[PDB]
Symmetry: C4
Amino acid sequence: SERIVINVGGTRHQTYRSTLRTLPGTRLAWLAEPDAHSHFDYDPRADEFFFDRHPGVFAHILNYYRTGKLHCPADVCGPLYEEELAFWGIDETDVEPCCWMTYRQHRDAEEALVAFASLFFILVSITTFCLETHERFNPETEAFLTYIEGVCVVWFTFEFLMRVIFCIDFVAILPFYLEVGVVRFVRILRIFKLTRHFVGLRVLGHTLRASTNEFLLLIIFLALGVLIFATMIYYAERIGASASEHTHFKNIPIGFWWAVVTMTTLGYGDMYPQTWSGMLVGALCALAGVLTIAMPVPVIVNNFGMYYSLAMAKQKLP
Amino acid sequence: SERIVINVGGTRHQTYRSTLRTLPGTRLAWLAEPDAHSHFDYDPRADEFFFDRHPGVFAHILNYYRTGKLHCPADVCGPLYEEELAFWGIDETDVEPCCWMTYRQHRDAEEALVAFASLFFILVSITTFCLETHERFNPETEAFLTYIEGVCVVWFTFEFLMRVIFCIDFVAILPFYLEVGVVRFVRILRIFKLTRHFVGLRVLGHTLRASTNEFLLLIIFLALGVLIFATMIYYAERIGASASEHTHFKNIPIGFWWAVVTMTTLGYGDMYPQTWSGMLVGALCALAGVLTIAMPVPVIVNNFGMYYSLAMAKQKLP
Amino acid sequence: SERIVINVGGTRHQTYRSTLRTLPGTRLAWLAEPDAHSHFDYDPRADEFFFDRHPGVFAHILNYYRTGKLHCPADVCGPLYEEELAFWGIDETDVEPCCWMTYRQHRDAEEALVAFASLFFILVSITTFCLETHERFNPETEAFLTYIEGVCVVWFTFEFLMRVIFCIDFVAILPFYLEVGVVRFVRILRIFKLTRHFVGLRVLGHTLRASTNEFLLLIIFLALGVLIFATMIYYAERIGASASEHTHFKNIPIGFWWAVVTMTTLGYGDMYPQTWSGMLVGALCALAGVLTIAMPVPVIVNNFGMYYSLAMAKQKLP
Amino acid sequence: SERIVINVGGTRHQTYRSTLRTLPGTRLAWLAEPDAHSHFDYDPRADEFFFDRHPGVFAHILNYYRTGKLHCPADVCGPLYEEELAFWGIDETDVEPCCWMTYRQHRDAEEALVAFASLFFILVSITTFCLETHERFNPETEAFLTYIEGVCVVWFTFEFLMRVIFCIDFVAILPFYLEVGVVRFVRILRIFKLTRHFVGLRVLGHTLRASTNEFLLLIIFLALGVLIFATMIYYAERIGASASEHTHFKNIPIGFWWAVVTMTTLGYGDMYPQTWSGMLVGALCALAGVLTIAMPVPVIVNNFGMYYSLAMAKQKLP
Ligand SMILES: [K+]
Ligand SMILES: [K+]
Ligand SMILES: [K+]
Ligand SMILES: [K+]
């Protein structure tokens, strides 16, 4: 029933010993015993214990011993609070689910998370790749395109004989091999090499890796919706009435196309309902797709907002 | 006019008895009278009352007795504050409407709110269900699909004779009864059986149940807009001039289709305005639909953000 | 240089008189002079002044006298701070622009801001209005529709001779007069009569009135974009080459339609670019419209979020 | 080992000198040595140092000396904390990246960031510019259009002989020069002359200049996606099978159009996939474009929200 005072950074908190012995493995629980005087900073005329720390966030630490639970203040950031919990001996996993997400956001985002003589020929190779398909240079190929191919491969050797014995490379600079030896479908990926110096694409790559669950969620939502609406639209268009000679929806498989074009509010118009039942089903499909897509995408977009703001805050400071 | 001190967790608050008497049914109101000395923790040389609670959130409780009204601090969470209101005797419905929603959101969101031998045949049944509609296996039916149905039903008994006398089951395993006797429109819903173990679909189901009013709102908005613009576009296209043989909008009913395809920014293109008045009306319809849809949808999406974040944080703590 | 202590709700603040005399018309400025001893609550053993108010929010009031400026705390709500500024004598217009909007949000949102025997015939009237346009009951008109018109007009008197001498009535029940004597374009609007009891449409009406500037903004943005892109697409499609017999864009006016259908991501497809220059212009138009629309619409949507949350928090407390 | 008390605005903080000498060039560091008594306000009966500043935000300043790092409180605004760091001698670039953006937002947004006798003829010129393109006034030109042109030019001098010798002027009023001597493609831009007094367009211009990086990001994302998906759709549509006479995608360049019309959810429908491989690729393209666009656009939209709210808070205070 005795009472003990903690003079934290000037601010005097009072409590009972009983409250301190509630979590026995921590630093505070080491003051409740009848010797703590010879183990701490003990003012023996004010009868108190001095600790040189933030007096503001201590009352949220003491609350753990007082009530039963550990929350996070909303007037300090994650790192400040975690530094204080680290000082006091509190396991940072007892944070209640109301406060865990905001408490961890910054750490979850931290997570460790001749160039012009290359870019020119990369762009050259991309363009020549694109124009061999155009039926302007296929009278049936032509030959200046093969010469420009020659030049880009003759340079790809100068910056690739610097790689393996002179030591994105084995999985993207294979066409250099296969040219004399997907043949060019891979050639575009070299654009990634020169743009890995961009602070925005690396933040993108980190976001597409910290959000693999919210991608599975979106894919499963879309698959469920597409199946449901594809099968509804078939039976809805069937009551308009052998065969189906009056409707774009001749089977359920061809309805997956319609459903995915509709749920995204794209709407080409090659497939659309033509009976009133179908029009009702399609009115439903449009809104259902809007909501289905709109639920997990904000979760994926906040991740980018956070990581981008952090990676650009770093790129502005010395 | 006498004054009283409350030493809450070290921090000394002062008031007059008069202020305390303002809410007479609470714990504080029991200190104003001349016997609390022998009913509480009373230091009779500092003349004060010790209470072993968070000293930070008390000044928002005392404010109730001081001014007239009860607000919620924005530096603590909902659960911490509600625990202390519970300690002090305050009815948590006196929270003013400025602070009520932010105070309750976490509690409103809490609300408690052989597998490989089954999934295989579920997928098998789904695909065979999709493929008898395709006019490739209808030279008019075929027979290997009928045997595939046979084997899936011969398995559906091994997981269904386990349920009702061996005791979504009656409303989704009826086709098992129905095949030998909607005939298979219901067959797809078995997909939900194996996917009720997904933490994302259960969060979805909880959000479509905590947001039944914001769905009514959206549907009513859309119906109002669709009717208004459908009747506007008819009269707008009529001044372009026995009949109207120059316009997609031959009646007002056929215009509900146009209006809903337009207000969603889908735009198939089977129906579009062709006179200048019609184009003005359609320009209005597009933006009106954008805003109409965009007002309640963010309310519905915040619910998912909250519930999903909570259910995923729970899946990460021990 | 003398110093004075203000004991607000237990918490002792210290300052110099010099700081107090900085705003001379307020309550604090009345303590600096050498007679306040007999005009307030003055402990003449602590040499201090007691005030029975929130001790936390006072340090943001004192800051005004200390530095020069008035800000709003982010750990209390608008109304609490407003009541304290009202108590201390501070003109609530001195709030710096960093804190003004967050300070006023709740007050800007407050701003004070037989049924089945009516709804039935309203719905009946709406339908019969919709189906005289359909060329199924126009072999030209028909007669059961005229009888249904008769019966709803015979009822509209029983709820309209209840209004003017027995005393949305004048500007919605003109068709009553106008039937026997726009004739029905207005007949639709009676739907609003029965839906004025809806908590969602009233919040809509309040939001469509508290955001009349953010509507002018959107309209002006769209007008500028439509004009610029309509004139750009004409000249862009003209280099594809006595007339223009190869392009949807024969003049600049007809391009306003294209531009508004494109900037909304609707895309019917009746007009699209067909030369490479046009495709570049259209690629620009799509994204420019996306961004133009997406800038003011979130401002308009937050207003609805706020007003709806308030109107539903009110409908949940007694 | 000695301890020192700082009495900031009433609130007494304690620390050791050891902590104070951690940052040796600041104001606090000037108290650690044994002469500061004669350089500050030193009560030699409580042995303490009085400073007349906000006692609340000091504990976040003192934390810098205590732990190692500088954070920003979330209960005060940017400018308040900035003024306090300025008072105490702290370099405001030591703010850790968790708190830097929230600290700077208001300053990043501050950054200093006859009318009817003109507007009439501006609108007149715009209209005239629009209708000589229309093939109703081209029997091929006409002459009342040239007379209206003449009148608006012979007014253009009364506001343009007032500007350069009586001294957006050279780069918008060159058409006046070139009329008698792009001839009018520039003629539309005069609309900006009269609308540069609009509070919304100036805020628009400020966000379009404070967000030039998030535009580069969007453009690069879109270019990457367009190239990748245009290459994929060609090869995907090729396996549907002496030429390509069955598909809209005859070469890779013409697929850039498809990809940009699809990634924006516009979907004209002049180009769409027709084989199942193509349909899979297009299903991917739609969602990929949605996400690609939706990542940086919210960053661009928050800037407008902030700058507009600030410019309207300024336009409402005296
Ligand atoms: K769209
Ligand atoms: K479309
Ligand atoms: K569309
Ligand atoms: K379309």
